[PDB]
Write a protein that binds this ligand. Structure first.
Ligand SMILES: Nc1nc2c(ncn2[C@H]2C[C@H](O)[C@@H](COP(=O)(O)OP(=O)(O)[C@H](F)P(=O)(O)O)O2)c(=O)[nH]1
Ligand SMILES: [Cl-]
Ligand SMILES: [Cl-]
Ligand SMILES: [Cl-]
Ligand SMILES: [Mg+2]
Ligand code: NA
Ligand code: NA
Ligand code: NA
Length: 326
DNA sequence: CCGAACAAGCATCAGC
DNA sequence: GCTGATGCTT
DNA sequence: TTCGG
């Protein structure tokens, strides 16, 4: 982390604009700049040097000059002093509490972890579970635990139906030594873009992982997206593992390669890649890549039989998962 | 100077 | 009930 | 907040 000081500052700024200002474009601006600086292979010596990077403009450049001279940013130090900003920012760290609910809670004087705990009746289901495991969800997952969780998920999915295919994606598939959560892509041959032959395809998997006490809680759940909580089982007299966020996405089997591209990320990589696709004349989502007309209407899906087909279409060299950690 | 800035599933609410 | 917009999250 | 045209 050559420029860890600068990238923390920018991330803290991005969080401020998102949670407090509700200014999504400033937030994306700071996050993109933090990501382009994180991969820049030199120790930045001036904001002018940084401004050579795309995504670093005038305003971020002078902020980087301030930080390099003084080690601090006055704007951030003030935001830290402000109670309402500190409280809104804190509350948004509970899963299911966003900037709107956080500001509304603060209006009602709900302002701290203890405030939340004494007001659970005021939370929806998701927020209640986010508060429940608030400490656990901020711990990272060593890759060695991701490997145990993977082995549980793939083996339980195998017992439901041998034709399911479960792929762990996210930072794990990018080779990260620790992950914030576990992301599981699910396919089954009965579910394609053309037909859904079996019902409750995701349900059955959720139910099987609940019954072996791997999945502990549910945050949200539909026919194709499960968001919930899991916990590794511990040995006799060992202390429990933390609970962990798990996301499961059932994708049409014929659309796996778009699905695994989407779910491997990163989120910023996805944004950068889908943006460039537009410039090249395509739109990419988790299902398809399609040409755009002159009007701006998506045409029919183009054929895809590997991740790299998608890169080819928009004329990018293939980048292995490991190199998509923007 | 001005428009664009990735794409979408689920929970929840308002309005009919 | 349904539709559509918003919040929140991936 | 930054970029491209
Ligand atoms: N197009 C688009 N895709 C998004 C977005 N947010 C998450 N994704 C994608 C890609 C992720 O890696 C993936 C999982 O979402 P994630 O929040 O688990 O991200 P991640 O890459 O796994 C993190 F590094 P970690 O989980 O380890 O803290 O889903 C988004 O805003 N737009
Ligand atoms: Cl904005
Ligand atoms: Cl600072
Ligand atoms: Cl599509
Ligand atoms: Mg993840
Ligand atoms: Na720049
Ligand atoms: Na939150
Ligand atoms: Na996730």
């Amino acid at each position: 982390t050559l420029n860890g000081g600068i990238t923390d500052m920018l991330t803290e700024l991005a969080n401020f604009e998102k949670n407090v200002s509700q200014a999504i474009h400033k937030y994306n601006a700071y996050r993109k700049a933090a990501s382009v600086i994180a991969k820049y292979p030199h120790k930045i010596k001036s904001g002018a040097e940084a401004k050579k990077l795309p995504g670093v403009g005038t305003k971020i450049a002078e902020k980087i000059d301030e930080f390099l001279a003084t080690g601090k940013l006055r704007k951030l130090e003030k935001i830290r002093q402000d109670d309402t900003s500190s409280s809104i920012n804190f509350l948004t760290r509970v899963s299911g509490i966003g900037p709107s609910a956080a500001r509304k809670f603060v209006d009602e004087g709900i302002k701290t972890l203890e405030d939340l705990r004494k007001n659970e009746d005021k939370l929806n289901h998701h927020q209640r579970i986010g508060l429940k495991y608030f400490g656990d969800f901020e711990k990272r997952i060593p890759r060695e635990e991701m490997l145990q969780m993977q082995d549980i998920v793939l083996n339980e999915v195998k017992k439901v139906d041998s034709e399911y295919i479960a792929t762990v994606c996210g930072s794990f598939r990018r080779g990260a030594e620790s992950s914030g959560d576990m992301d599981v892509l699910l396919t089954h041959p009965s579910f394609t873009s053309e037909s859904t032959k079996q019902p409750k395809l995701l349900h059955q998997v959720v139910e099987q992982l609940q019954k072996v006490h791997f999945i502990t809680d549910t945050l949200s759940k539909g026919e194709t997206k499960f968001m919930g909580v899991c916990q590794l089982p511990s040995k006799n007299d060992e202390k429990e593992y933390p609970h962990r966020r798990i996301d499961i996405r059932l994708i049409p089997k014929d659309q796996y390669y778009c699905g695994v591209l989407y779910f491997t990320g990163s989120d910023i990589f996805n944004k950068n890649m889908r943006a460039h696709a537009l410039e090249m004349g395509f739109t990419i989502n988790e299902y398809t890549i399609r040409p755009l007309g002159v009007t701006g209407v998506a045409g029919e899906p183009l054929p895809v039989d590997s991740e790299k087909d998608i890169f080819d279409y928009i004329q990018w060299k293939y980048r292995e998962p490991k190199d998509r950690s923007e």
